[PDB]
Design an enzyme around this catalytic site. Structure first.
Site, mmCIF file in Angstrom:
data_model
loop_
_atom_site.group_PDB
_atom_site.id
_atom_site.type_symbol
_atom_site.label_atom_id
_atom_site.label_comp_id
_atom_site.label_asym_id
_atom_site.label_seq_id
_atom_site.Cartn_x
_atom_site.Cartn_y
_atom_site.Cartn_z
ATOM 1 N N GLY A 16 -32.322 -20.811 -50.687
ATOM 2 C CA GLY A 16 -33.925 -21.014 -49.511
ATOM 3 C C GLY A 16 -33.104 -21.209 -48.525
ATOM 4 O O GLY A 16 -32.181 -20.512 -48.270
ATOM 5 N N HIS A 17 -33.516 -20.406 -47.243
ATOM 6 C CA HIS A 17 -33.692 -19.585 -45.704
ATOM 7 C C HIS A 17 -34.633 -20.491 -45.265
ATOM 8 O O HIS A 17 -36.096 -20.410 -45.875
ATOM 9 C CB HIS A 17 -33.118 -17.876 -45.703
ATOM 10 C CG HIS A 17 -33.446 -17.781 -44.287
ATOM 11 N ND1 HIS A 17 -34.158 -17.582 -43.497
ATOM 12 C CD2 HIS A 17 -32.449 -17.809 -44.080
ATOM 13 C CE1 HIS A 17 -33.965 -17.007 -42.272
ATOM 14 N NE2 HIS A 17 -32.124 -16.801 -42.756
ATOM 15 N N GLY A 18 -34.663 -21.233 -44.040
ATOM 16 C CA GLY A 18 -35.484 -21.376 -43.234
ATOM 17 C C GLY A 18 -34.927 -21.230 -41.892
ATOM 18 O O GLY A 18 -33.579 -21.251 -41.789
ATOM 19 N N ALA A 19 -35.816 -21.666 -40.778
ATOM 20 C CA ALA A 19 -35.412 -22.023 -39.270
ATOM 21 C C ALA A 19 -34.515 -22.511 -38.915
ATOM 22 O O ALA A 19 -33.124 -22.373 -38.035
ATOM 23 C CB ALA A 19 -36.043 -22.108 -38.012
ATOM 24 N N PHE A 20 -33.559 -23.461 -40.014
ATOM 25 C CA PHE A 20 -32.799 -24.413 -39.759
ATOM 26 C C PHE A 20 -31.807 -24.810 -40.757
ATOM 27 O O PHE A 20 -30.895 -26.067 -40.614
ATOM 28 C CB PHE A 20 -33.761 -25.527 -38.991
ATOM 29 C CG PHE A 20 -34.335 -25.622 -38.231
ATOM 30 C CD1 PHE A 20 -33.857 -25.080 -37.117
ATOM 31 C CD2 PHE A 20 -35.630 -26.025 -38.018
ATOM 32 C CE1 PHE A 20 -35.321 -24.927 -36.324
ATOM 33 C CE2 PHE A 20 -37.273 -25.834 -37.400
ATOM 34 C CZ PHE A 20 -36.813 -25.068 -36.010
ATOM 35 N N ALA A 21 -32.004 -24.506 -41.745
ATOM 36 C CA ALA A 21 -31.186 -24.207 -42.739
ATOM 37 C C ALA A 21 -30.784 -23.182 -43.131
ATOM 38 O O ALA A 21 -32.595 -22.240 -44.213
ATOM 39 C CB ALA A 21 -31.160 -25.810 -43.659
ATOM 40 N N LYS A 39 -25.693 -26.021 -47.970
ATOM 41 C CA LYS A 39 -26.967 -26.210 -47.020
ATOM 42 C C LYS A 39 -26.138 -26.301 -45.297
ATOM 43 O O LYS A 39 -24.953 -27.219 -45.652
ATOM 44 C CB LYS A 39 -27.866 -28.071 -46.351
ATOM 45 C CG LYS A 39 -28.635 -27.415 -45.756
ATOM 46 C CD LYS A 39 -29.878 -28.597 -45.951
ATOM 47 C CE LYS A 39 -31.670 -27.726 -46.072
ATOM 48 N NZ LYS A 39 -32.011 -29.583 -46.291
ATOM 49 N N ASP A 131 -41.274 -34.806 -43.172
ATOM 50 C CA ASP A 131 -41.595 -33.742 -43.860
ATOM 51 C C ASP A 131 -41.593 -33.653 -44.972
ATOM 52 O O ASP A 131 -41.234 -32.381 -45.485
ATOM 53 C CB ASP A 131 -40.436 -32.806 -43.181
ATOM 54 C CG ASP A 131 -40.434 -31.361 -43.102
ATOM 55 O OD1 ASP A 131 -41.387 -31.022 -42.847
ATOM 56 O OD2 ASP A 131 -39.567 -30.009 -42.943
HETATM 57 C C1 LIG Z 1 -28.466 -17.705 -57.783
HETATM 58 C C2 LIG Z 1 -29.215 -18.599 -58.361
HETATM 59 O O1 LIG Z 1 -29.072 -18.468 -59.289
HETATM 60 N N1 LIG Z 1 -30.927 -18.635 -57.618
HETATM 61 C C3 LIG Z 1 -31.640 -19.063 -58.057
HETATM 62 C C4 LIG Z 1 -33.207 -19.052 -57.481
HETATM 63 O O2 LIG Z 1 -32.771 -18.816 -56.566
HETATM 64 N N2 LIG Z 1 -33.895 -20.225 -57.880
HETATM 65 C C5 LIG Z 1 -33.975 -21.773 -58.667
HETATM 66 C C6 LIG Z 1 -35.237 -21.596 -58.963
HETATM 67 C C7 LIG Z 1 -35.939 -21.105 -58.105
HETATM 68 C C8 LIG Z 1 -35.014 -20.697 -56.905
HETATM 69 C C9 LIG Z 1 -34.457 -21.851 -56.625
HETATM 70 C C10 LIG Z 1 -34.669 -22.992 -55.540
HETATM 71 C C11 LIG Z 1 -34.330 -23.982 -55.279
HETATM 72 C C12 LIG Z 1 -33.678 -24.304 -56.385
HETATM 73 N N3 LIG Z 1 -32.476 -25.587 -55.703
HETATM 74 C C13 LIG Z 1 -32.351 -26.374 -54.947
HETATM 75 N N4 LIG Z 1 -31.513 -27.851 -55.075
HETATM 76 C C14 LIG Z 1 -31.300 -28.116 -54.092
HETATM 77 C C15 LIG Z 1 -31.934 -27.861 -52.504
HETATM 78 C C16 LIG Z 1 -31.219 -29.006 -51.811
HETATM 79 F F1 LIG Z 1 -30.533 -29.625 -51.807
HETATM 80 F F2 LIG Z 1 -30.885 -28.112 -50.375
HETATM 81 F F3 LIG Z 1 -31.976 -29.423 -51.139
HETATM 82 C C17 LIG Z 1 -32.229 -26.992 -52.605
HETATM 83 N N5 LIG Z 1 -33.254 -26.382 -51.468
HETATM 84 C C18 LIG Z 1 -33.662 -25.182 -51.338
HETATM 85 C C19 LIG Z 1 -33.349 -24.082 -50.368
HETATM 86 C C20 LIG Z 1 -35.302 -23.416 -50.575
HETATM 87 C C21 LIG Z 1 -35.384 -25.357 -51.231
HETATM 88 N N6 LIG Z 1 -32.498 -25.946 -53.772
HETATM 89 C C22 LIG Z 1 -33.412 -23.809 -57.403
HETATM 90 C C23 LIG Z 1 -33.621 -22.267 -57.680
#
Ligand SMILES: CC(=O)NCC(=O)N1[C@@H]2CC[C@H]1c1ccc(Nc3ncc(C(F)(F)F)c(NC4CCC4)n3)cc12
EC number: 2.7.11.1
Length: 274
Positions: A16-21, A39, A131
């Site tokens: 995941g990608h946002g403006a601040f992380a 993060k 948020d």
């Molecule tokens: C490389 C890989 O295995 N990719 C998996 C992927 O991109 N997925 C898996 C299932 C949907 C998407 C996805 C997004 C987020 C998570 N898990 C997760 N866990 C903790 C955090 C956190 F601890 F950072 F919050 C987090 N943050 C993300 C940034 C967008 C939401 N995401 C898992 C996934």
């Protein structure tokens, strides 16, 4: 491969990608099967990213709960900041809702019981999140992604905008996502922890219907709608159970003084229904 204490990640594994992380999937360097979410600063917004990640650490180091994404470790240095968090294998509720369209009342109940538990801890500590939106509700199934959905555990994430609020004080910082902002927040008024209860009501309503309770073309338009309408009544589908109807009506009160309080939320009949 970059390392943060006992953890490692590749910038190839962006989740995941946002403006601040920016968030990467990583692992423990010794226990490769322990997945983590790392993060990192978004260098496009260096100063603000650094500030928000530092605040997130400050807040999450005080919050341990199943339904709050765990902070395993972190690393704050002069020019960079890392958070090593619990990896949630189910991704976010925004994506889950996009695929499911709407959730059964039983699934909403399971998720909301867990959100309520996390909010009990925030409320007891005097912390407001500010948020809450589906993108910050993460899903994890301890039995794995392909396991029984009855086993999905929910975790509140993204505490970078969170603050302590003394019980005789009000907050005034504009925080959150406009479609989930309490009226008092988007109208630039003073607010308190009940602003998060509006956000939760919006999330529950979206789970139930697949739409916003109060639709608008822009944040500006939504603000004008709230300014102009001193009573807000969401349309509750007639198939809705009485406890969920009453929960939504009480959370989606325009005026924070009239809105469900925390004790009413934690003990709400919707949450103790079979
Ligand atoms: C490389 C890989 O295995 N990719 C998996 C992927 O991109 N997925 C898996 C299932 C949907 C998407 C996805 C997004 C987020 C998570 N898990 C997760 N866990 C903790 C955090 C956190 F601890 F950072 F919050 C987090 N943050 C993300 C940034 C967008 C939401 N995401 C898992 C996934």
């Amino acid at each position: 491969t970059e390392t943060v204490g006992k953890f490692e990640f590749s910038r190839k594994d962006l989740i995941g990608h946002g403006a601040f992380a920016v968030v990467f999937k990583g692992r423990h360097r010794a226990a490769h099967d322990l997945e983590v979410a790392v993060k990192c600063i978004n260098k496009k917004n260096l100063a603000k990213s650094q500030t928000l990640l530092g605040k997130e650490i400050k807040i999450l180091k005080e919050l341990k709960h199943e339904n709050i994404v765990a902070l395993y470790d972190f690393q704050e240095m002069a020019n960079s900041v890392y958070l090593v968090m619990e990896y949630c294998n189910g991704g976010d509720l925004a994506d889950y809702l996009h695929a499911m369209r709407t959730l059964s009342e039983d699934t909403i109940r399971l998720f909301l019981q867990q959100i309520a538990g996390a909010m009990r801890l925030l409320h007891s500590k005097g912390i407001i999140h500010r948020d809450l939106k589906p993108q910050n509700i993460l899903l994890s199934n301890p039995a794995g992604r392909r396991a029984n959905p009855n086993s999905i555990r929910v975790k509140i994430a993204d505490f970078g905008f969170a603050r302590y609020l003394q019980s005789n004080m009000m907050a005034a910082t504009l925080c959150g996502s406009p479609m989930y902002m309490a009226p008092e927040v988007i109208m630039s008024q003073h607010y308190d922890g009940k602003a998060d209860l509006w956000s939760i009501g919006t999330i529950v309503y979206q789970c139930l219907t697949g739409k916003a309770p109060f639709q608008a073309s822009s944040p500006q338009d939504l603000r004008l709608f709230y300014e102009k309408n001193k009573t807000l009544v969401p349309t509750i589908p007639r198939e809705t159970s009485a406890p969920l109807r009453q929960l939504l009506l009480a959370l989606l009160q325009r005026n924070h003084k009239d809105r469900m309080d925390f004790d009413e939320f934690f003990h709400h009949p919707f949450l103790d229904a079979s």
